[PDB]
Structure 1
Amino acid sequence: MIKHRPHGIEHPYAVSPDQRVPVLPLAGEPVLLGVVAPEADRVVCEWGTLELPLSATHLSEAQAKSLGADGAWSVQTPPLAEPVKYRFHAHRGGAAESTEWFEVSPAVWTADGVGEVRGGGERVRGVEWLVSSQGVHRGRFRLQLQDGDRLVGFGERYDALDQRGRELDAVVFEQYKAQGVHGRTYLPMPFAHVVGADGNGWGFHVRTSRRTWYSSAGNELTVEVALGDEPVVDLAIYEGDPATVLTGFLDEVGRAEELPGWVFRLWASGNEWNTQQLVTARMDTHRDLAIPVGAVVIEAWSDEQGITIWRDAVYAVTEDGSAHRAEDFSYRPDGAWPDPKAMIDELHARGIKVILWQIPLQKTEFSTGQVAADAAAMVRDGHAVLEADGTAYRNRGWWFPQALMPDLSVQRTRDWWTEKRRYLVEHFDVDGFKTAGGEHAWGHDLVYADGRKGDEGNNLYPVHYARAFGDLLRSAGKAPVTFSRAGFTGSQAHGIFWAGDEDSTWQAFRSSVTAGLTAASCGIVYWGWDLAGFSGPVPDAELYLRAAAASAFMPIMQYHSEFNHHQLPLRDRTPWHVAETTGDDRVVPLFRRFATLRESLVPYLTEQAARTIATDRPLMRPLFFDHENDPEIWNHPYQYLLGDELLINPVLEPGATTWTTYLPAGEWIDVWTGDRVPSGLVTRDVPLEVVPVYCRASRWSELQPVFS
């Protein structure tokens, strides 16, 4: 047997051993041809009129092996001067087999074409098109920049606030940690601020959900756009100060709505709280240690099959794949969740909201049960995202492999899919969903029921996903509180976002701050991260407290911990476990101090979030919004305003006993001493109980009780 897929697995940053590299070669380029034939004596390619012998040949070694890296054949062809038809022939001991015919057409960049780039006015130059015998594959063009212009935007970015001088793209991808290092993201947008030095600033939005690439050198920003059947790039330009630029974007693509004030309290989470006993014990420790928590996320709450039913719940399976009613279920005394309603009711009585984990995937690896019935129903009734051949798409990723994706691009399947979760909101009264994932769709030719194809619709999927569960909550009369890592243009209007998975490191800390700042610049209001990281060994006391202090001054303050296989010792990120692991007796008292202060901040946050939604001036706010003509601000990219009145300067290095903050124009006050401070550089002591925070002098009469 022998297999060749020209596009391969269609990992956006990597190639599989079975594919053609590159998929679309430029004229003059050679092409590499991979093939997987685990047992064959010899493998040859019939290439045009020639015959090309294959040898035995960014994926990891574990991932590549699963795709057949062992027993993979490859050969580099002659350069592509024209379209070539080709196939492969493999022999095992005289037994012969041949692949279907494939064809590749080389492409060229040209300024000649019927294609238009519309809307850029006189800012656009150097328009060109990537064309082959198949058609126009990509547009490309240049935006004029001036000296001192910064590029801030592109959704949530982990490497730097200013993207000028960098190569990057916008595509939804799950990068498992180290997002800043690889320069990737779960939440890209083809939008950015061009932040003026000197004169009036502006911004742009490339209107597409397809892939876009970006690079800047000298005075030009180069924008490359993937295309569909129509060779047209629609470009929107927004003129004004940074807030006004954001307004133009958000007026076009959507905007946050006010969420309930309780989302501004501390969120407690850990993945290994997989029983009612554990959740209640963890929240009890919160109560007993007097550490206020406003919400608890339960990730492993479910049967781990369909992920819409409590673990060890007893019910009659519905063969038709219809949704369950609350009364369908029984909960046994000896099960993992003997009385989930009683648990939630008690939590609610304590003022704690309850959030359940979600994934937009239906496991196919079971032949029985509700999970199998629903999977069969998805295919039968057309609720699944489809391949080009009409079969159901199966997850090509390594996380939840082969699972189906519900097609959330249309209302009927959004209804059908969320209907399975309805009893959770209406009976059990859960207050939100942590809607994880959504990046799972890989293929250019995938078909969505809304008429979009994969190259267009795959980036849109996480937006549909958050909206689906936001709508479920609305339909139950509750605020649309969803908690999502993934998104795209339009995500601004659905729920809360966190920065995804990272190790516990100072680098990840710094990356996360950048992620929040860039996200806010694009209109993402309610944002957080897993403070001091959720993955690997427990953070040390210093990193934990530096992160905890700063996060209390961020839109969403939440701690979380990755699945450890239920080993001992625990990897929990709870304050008392950190104290336990580090042996540091300052962790619980100082975290309690931060959490207690955070509670006092809720009315301020609530008011500021309302201003942010009305004026589009960001909640976690880079200084260029108010201060754009101040050149000095760019030397302190980790500083920000929290709402109008508070400037925050996180301590991002270990061992720091002092910290220096740049205060822009206006009068300021040190919130810890109540003293007045002159604008410009300011240095103050930073013991672990302090993160530098300054208040506009005119409103310190309002903020003073908070810090008293």
Structure 2
Amino acid sequence: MITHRPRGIEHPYARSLDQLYPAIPIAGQSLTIGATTSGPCSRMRCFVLWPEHEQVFDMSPVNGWQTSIPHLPDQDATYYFEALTLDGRTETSESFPLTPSHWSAEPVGHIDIDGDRFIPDSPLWLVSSAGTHRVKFALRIEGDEHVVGFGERYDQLDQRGLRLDSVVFEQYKAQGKHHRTYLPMPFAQVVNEAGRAWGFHVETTRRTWYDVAATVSDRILIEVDLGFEAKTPVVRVNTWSGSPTDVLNGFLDVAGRPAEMPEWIFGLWASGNEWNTQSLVMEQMDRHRNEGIPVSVVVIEAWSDEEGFTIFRDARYVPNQGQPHRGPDFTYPSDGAWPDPAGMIRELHERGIRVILWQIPLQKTDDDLGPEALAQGNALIASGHVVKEPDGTPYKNRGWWFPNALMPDLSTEAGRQWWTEQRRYLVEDLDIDGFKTDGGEHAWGSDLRYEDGRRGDEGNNLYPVNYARAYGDLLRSAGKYPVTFSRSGFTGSQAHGLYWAGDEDSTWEAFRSSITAGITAGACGILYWGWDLAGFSGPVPEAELYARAFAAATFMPIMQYHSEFHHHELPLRDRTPWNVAEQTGCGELIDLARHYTRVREALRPYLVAQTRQCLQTGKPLMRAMFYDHADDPEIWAHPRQYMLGDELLINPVTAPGATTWTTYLPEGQWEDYWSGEVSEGGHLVTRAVGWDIIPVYRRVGAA
């Protein structure tokens, strides 16, 4: 048969071979029409039925076929495809509607917005006979203003001069180079060089695009998807002005505010994907103890049966019909991977170490699965609590990671509870302390259905917010802090747990990119942020990178090392101080990890106290210079310097071969963290940088 889907697979940054490009066809511009066949074909044509004119296009093959209409007429039409199979059948497709759109400056909708930066007659509305699909409007920016926000960004702090968008996506590595993110938000601050700021927030969970004075040097062009249903269009844009802090506080009053968190999150977090037995985990924690490199949290990713992510690997149990297990349901073989998971967790607690288990918001449907995971899958579908296609059947994951997996519907209390009830015994009976809530970026499709009544145009970006929320609520209901550790999010994510910057190679550019990610994330109210120090993917980082990154990571909100799955191949890829020391032949890295973990522990009361202040003030912890020094033009030339709380100015060393490093100190008296040497502000200062030093300066208080 012939397959044609007007929007295609709806990969946000890519197009399939069976769609219209553009997906919302535009009168005047060109229209590319693709379709696929399930068997081989010698020929295919596209018939287009306008009122008085018929046209037939000989499509060219890329089993994909394609043609294009160079200048699209402004009339409603219909189209269908005719293919000739190699065996001589003529196949014919369904009938499809073509309703070309145009931009009009007529008051089709209303943009509800205050403040004097809105351009009164900039609104353009993309309209057809089907309705109103997108709006395009503008805000003016002045020659001394800088733009920071749009969530976690990996390319640069100041977004002025760039074209970007805000859609949840998984960009596997090089997020900076590709200009994408796991955690965007349709919000930004605009900060001038006299200390005053304004901000804006497009109140939607639909996709938004921004041209931040790239095309028009004094205009921020905003484009907003109005969505599948296409209803009289009203777009609400919240706005604030005052100090940079007033503006971020504005947004948090709407979006949500960070939670209180227990002090144990500020110790070193140990992680490695190939710690996949109880003995591998304990071997590493005993090594931490014996080396004097204290760890406060261990993350176990490869803990489960790798089918349902609810049961420890090799656990034995009576089969359930998909209802939740309790802890006494399980017997653990002595010679299995996890002989006594409750015993591991108890012992680790007795040592002061908390345990976190990886989770994914996907239910595998491989044909390899055992009976328990199939039953768990059928029970999820049977509950109704599954994201659905327009036809009502379950959404099958369109990615190549976990292909065709189901996606639990976490849009309602009942669906979140259904999903997390399967995991409750882990918290209540085995006593885990939290979850690495990975993923959430898998929902592609404008026309998907959620139980809250949203379609995919609004629900898909909202998914990771609901997802982190789900597990937080599980943990609260079990008497524990909502320590979730997530990589994706949206407006609302501020209130739900901790965040890390995702997947990167072990490179200097990724180190730089990660700093930028933490600062930008802080600037949109993601307070509890971390990253995989020195990178998690590929060969172990070179010694110099690990040294510089470990140092930097000591002065960031969440400090952890992690390593990617590598099939248990050789050499070992752990980012442990000892493995990186052995692979690099630099035994000194173990001492250095001792040194900086001692600094980390001494830093913990400051991290606790400054976090508490951040909750009241609204200011980030990992804090861009403009929050306290926006009246100093010179801060913008040093965008990878940042404040850690009110008192410390941090400047990581991000270049190999560096023996000195230069820092810009803002106005005031400053004190070298390591030597006590006093410098006066308003000046550049230079520091020797042995690997035991990262430039850090403390404000000099009154005597």
TM-score (norm 2): 0.96
Q: CA deviation at 1:79?
A: 2.3
2:89 aligned with 1:86: no
- Within 2, Cα distance between the matches of 1:534 and 1:253? 31
- Match of 1:62? none
- Match of 2:690? 687
- Match of 1:457? 459
- Match of 2:16? 16
- Residue 356 of structure 1 aligns to a residue in which SS? strand
Q: Letter of the 1:74 partner, please give it.
A: Q
- Residue 344 of structure 1 aligns to a residue in which SS? helix
Query: What does 1:145-544 correspond to in 2, within 5 Å?
Result: 145-198=141-194, 200-217=196-213, 218-228=217-227, 229-319=231-321, 321-366=322-367, 368-544=370-546
2:2 aligned with 1:6: no
CA shift digits 1:606-630 (9 cap, x unpaired):
0000110110111001010000111
- Match of 2:108? 114
Q: CA deviation at 1:562?
A: 0.4
Partners of 1:4 and 1:35 within 8 A in 2: yes
- Match of 1:607? 609
Q: CA deviation at 1:672?
A: 0.8
Q: Letter of the 1:322 partner, please give it.
A: Q
Q: CA deviation at 1:494?
A: 0.4
- Within 1, Cα distance between the matches of 2:405 and 2:370? 15
Q: Letter of the 1:19 partner, please give it.
A: Q
Q: 2:89 aligns with which of 81, 87, 95?
A: 95
Partners of 1:147 and 1:197 within 8 A in 2: no
Q: 2:565 aligns with which of 563, 581, 586?
A: 563
Q: CA deviation at 1:200?
A: 2.8
- Residue 3 of structure 2 aligns to a residue in which SS? coil
- Match of 1:52? 57
Q: Letter of the 1:422 partner, please give it.
A: R
Q: Percent identity?
A: 60
CA shift digits 1:131-178 (9 cap, x unpaired):
112111111111111111000000000001000110000000000000
Structure 2 spans left out of the alignment, 5+ residues = none
Q: Letter of the 2:698 partner, please give it.
A: C
Partners of 1:173 and 1:185 within 8 A in 2: yes
- Within 1, Cα distance between the matches of 2:570 and 2:249? 50
Q: CA deviation at 1:337?
A: 0.4
2:72 aligned with 1:72: no
Partners of 2:196 and 2:630 within 8 A in 1: no
Q: CA deviation at 1:346?
A: 1.1
- Residue 611 of structure 2 aligns to a residue in which SS? helix
- Match of 1:596? 598
- Within 2, Cα distance between the matches of 1:316 and 1:79? 65
Partners of 1:505 and 1:533 within 8 A in 2: yes
Q: Letter of the 1:354 partner, please give it.
A: V
Q: CA deviation at 1:77?
A: 2.4
- Within 1, Cα distance between the matches of 2:247 and 2:513? 25
Q: CA deviation at 1:595?
A: 0.9
Partners of 1:47 and 1:84 within 8 A in 2: yes
- Residue 465 of structure 1 aligns to a residue in which SS? helix
Q: Letter of the 1:154 partner, please give it.
A: F
Q: CA deviation at 1:199?
A: 6.1
- The structure-2 alpha-carbon separation of the partners of 1:219 and 1:198, relative to structure 1 and needing over 3 Å to count, comes to farther
Q: CA deviation at 1:197?
A: 2.6
CA RMSD of aligned residues (A): 1.1
- Residue 330 of structure 1 aligns to a residue in which SS? coil
Partners of 2:396 and 2:405 within 8 A in 1: yes
- Residue 373 of structure 2 aligns to a residue in which SS? helix
Partners of 1:52 and 1:77 within 8 A in 2: no
- The structure-2 alpha-carbon separation of the partners of 1:438 and 1:230, relative to structure 1 and needing over 3 Å to count, comes to farther
- Residue 135 of structure 2 aligns to a residue in which SS? strand
Q: Letter of the 1:87 partner, please give it.
A: Y
- Within 2, Cα distance between the matches of 1:443 and 1:471? 27
2:21 aligned with 1:29: no
Query: What does 1:116-131 correspond to in 2, within 5 Å?
Result: 116-125=110-119, 126-131=122-127
CA shift digits 1:551-605 (9 cap, x unpaired):
1000000000000011011111111000000001211101111011101111110
Q: CA deviation at 1:499?
A: 0.1
Q: CA deviation at 1:368?
A: 4.3
- Within 1, Cα distance between the matches of 2:141 and 2:435? 42
- Within 2, Cα distance between the matches of 1:230 and 1:238? 26
- Residue 139 of structure 2 aligns to a residue in which SS? strand
- Within 2, Cα distance between the matches of 1:334 and 1:200? 65
CA shift digits 1:324-354 (9 cap, x unpaired):
1111111111111011111111111111110
- Within 1, Cα distance between the matches of 2:411 and 2:102? 34
- Match of 1:60? none
Q: How many positions carry a matched residue from both structures? A: 686
- Within 1, Cα distance between the matches of 2:366 and 2:116? 55
Partners of 2:182 and 2:488 within 8 A in 1: yes
- Residue 41 of structure 1 aligns to a residue in which SS? strand
- Within 1, Cα distance between the matches of 2:241 and 2:495? 22
Partners of 2:548 and 2:654 within 8 A in 1: yes
- Within 1, Cα distance between the matches of 2:311 and 2:618? 39
Q: CA deviation at 1:377?
A: 1.3
- Residue 460 of structure 1 aligns to a residue in which SS? helix
Partners of 2:195 and 2:630 within 8 A in 1: no
- Residue 464 of structure 2 aligns to a residue in which SS? helix
2:628 aligned with 1:629: no
Q: CA deviation at 1:2?
A: 2.0
Q: CA deviation at 1:283?
A: 1.0
- Within 2, Cα distance between the matches of 1:522 and 1:120? 21
Which has the larger displacement, 201-210 or 373-382? 373-382
- Residue 636 of structure 2 aligns to a residue in which SS? helix
- Within 2, Cα distance between the matches of 1:260 and 1:490? 21
Partners of 2:195 and 2:629 within 8 A in 1: no
- Within 2, Cα distance between the matches of 1:438 and 1:199? 38
Partners of 1:242 and 1:624 within 8 A in 2: yes
Q: CA deviation at 1:75?
A: 1.2
- Residue 306 of structure 2 aligns to a residue in which SS? coil
CA shift digits 1:98-123 (9 cap, x unpaired):
11111222111111033011123432
Which has the larger displacement, 115-124 or 138-147? 115-124
- Within 2, Cα distance between the matches of 1:414 and 1:455? 20
Q: Letter of the 2:513 partner, please give it.
A: S
Partners of 2:194 and 2:632 within 8 A in 1: no
- Match of 1:672? 674
- Within 1, Cα distance between the matches of 2:557 and 2:474? 24
- Within 1, Cα distance between the matches of 2:359 and 2:296? 20
- Within 2, Cα distance between the matches of 1:596 and 1:197? 39
Partners of 1:24 and 1:104 within 8 A in 2: no
- Residue 300 of structure 1 aligns to a residue in which SS? coil
Q: Letter of the 2:562 partner, please give it.
A: H
